[PDB]
Amino acid sequence: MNRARDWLEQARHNLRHAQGSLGLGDYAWACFAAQQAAEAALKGLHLARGQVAWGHSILDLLADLPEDVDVPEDLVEAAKVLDKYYIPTRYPDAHPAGPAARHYTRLEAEEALDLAQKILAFVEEKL
Amino acid sequence: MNRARDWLEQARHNLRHAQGSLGLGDYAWACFAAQQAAEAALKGLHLARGQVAWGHSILDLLADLPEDVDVPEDLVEAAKVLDKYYIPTRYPDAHPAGPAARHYTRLEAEEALDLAQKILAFVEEKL
Predict the structure, then answer these.
(1) Nearest to A10 among B24, B40, B101 (CB)
(2) Residue B67 Cα distances to A54, A71, B57, B71, angstroms
(3) What Å distances lie between residue B2 and A99, A112, B14, B49, CA to CA?
(4) Total structural domains in chain A?
(5) Between chain A and chain B, how many beta carbons pairs sit less than 8 Å apart?
(6) A119 to chain B nearest CA, in Å?
(7) Which domain holds residue B102?
(8) CATH code where residue A114 lies
(9) CB contact under 8 A, A24 and B29
(10) Which residues in chain A have Cβ-Cβ distances shorter than 8 Å to B93?
């Protein structure tokens, strides 16, 4: 469906990369990869409904979906959490001190995987 | 000073995530993290010199350094290669078909690690 499948494939790969990052102990990177899984999955859902979407805000990605797509409120809350992982997980100036990587923990990254999985599952069922 | 060191430590962490990614078999993510190690290292060098720099172009980051910093042609060549891993390693629309991930090889990832190490060593040297 005009590459929608390719983006879903990328989203699943990104989520596997976040799972493996968890195993490497690279929590901030796992969080970034989870936001990337969510982003790619939603861009794929947009493509399947004939739209091209942009950016890194999964909040906008969810808000711009066709009217016939019902978005549960829990996905909006997941979006707000994941949205803080696109830039702060990699750039030191997003935090008061130290490198970006040290501000992220395992529990945060597992929660990030959980939230991204909810997004992926919603997309897989709406495709 | 000016957090140059926080950025260098982020660079090193990025390079370590690149090495783990190679271990996971996630070659496209290893290439992306290598570009991120180089980008963070050079941003750190600009901070050390009291300049702030922006973007994801290692080529522009090298070209914008102060006249007195000697940049071997080697690094410019390396920048050109790394610059192609910021977006294509994660986004399917940067390729003709399939997800982005399948278009990157183990050798590509091995070399990206080497090129980012070259860039990091240069920055540590001029720091």
Answers:
(1) B101
(2) 38, 54, 18, 9
(3) 13, 31, 20, 9
(4) 1
(5) 74
(6) 18
(7) 1-127
(8) 1.20.120.330
(9) no
(10) 3
